[PDB]
């Protein structure tokens, strides 16, 4: 269904936020 | 449907936050 | 509809968060 | 309706987070 | 209604996040 | 109801994030 | 119910974010 | 159900954000 699909897209976007925050951690290390 | 479309716009906005955080990581790396 | 409109306003606010985080990245650069 | 009104209050609160993050960018620029 | 009330409590909590981020900005200033 | 109760638990968790961010501001002030 | 349970899991995850932010505050102190 | 499953994926993504923030704390500690 379209609502579950859209919530799955929000989950994917939050995972992209996590990946970006890992990039910040690496930049501080470095 | 309009609710699914609005949730997809929230996902796009969260991807924009992810990209902004990537930009911060690049700024720290410099 | 009013719920979809309100979700669209949440998306716009998350885009404002992204813009603010870009301003942080620029301040670090710088 | 009260649910749409409450979602609009969440959007306003997210704009407040955006403004706080702008304040952080200004503090770093100084 | 209880759902609208609970969403209003989430809005209040996001405003508390904004206030905490302002405190961070002040600490950097500083 | 159980959905309202779960949304109230999300609000409490967001207040915990706010308090953690206050802690970060205090750490920067030191 | 499964939706309330899933919202409770989102609350637990936001509490984990709060704990991680406390770890950041401690690292700055340090 | 598919909505509960999608909300569980959002919770997992928020745990990924928590772990990324832990990584940032470790980077600052070094």
Residue numbers in the entry:
A (entry chain B), B (entry chain A), C (entry chain B), D (entry chain A), E (entry chain B), F (entry chain A), ...: 1 to 30
Excerpt from the paper describing this PDB structure:
αHBs are oligomers of 5 or more α-helical peptides that assemble into coiled-coil structures with central solvent-accessible channels. We targeted two properties of αHBs: oligomeric state, which directly affects the internal diameter of the channel; and the identities of channel-facing residues, which fine tune this dimension and introduce different chemistries. The αHBs are loaded with an environment sensitive dye (in this case, 1,6-diphenyl-1,3,5-hexatriene, DPH) that binds within the channels and fluoresces. Accordingly, challenging the array with analytes leads to differential displacement of the dye across the array to give a fluorescent fingerprint.
Despite the requirements for aliphatic residues at a and d, up to 40% of these can be changed to other side chains without compromising barrel integrity. We introduced mutations at one or two of these sites to generate four groups of αHB: Group I had entirely hydrophobic interiors, but with different sizes and shapes of channel; Groups II and III had polar uncharged or polar charged residues, respectively, at specific points along the channel; and Group IV had aromatic residues installed in their channels. The eleven Group II peptides comprised: single mutants to Cys, His, Asn, Ser or Thr at d sites; and double mutations to His, Asn, Ser or Thr at consecutive a and d sites. Finally, one third of the designs were crystallized and yielded 12 X-ray crystal structures, all of which were open αHBs with fully accessible channels. Focusing on the small molecules, the αSA signal from the more-polar AAs and CHOs is dominated by the polar and charged Group II and III αHBs.
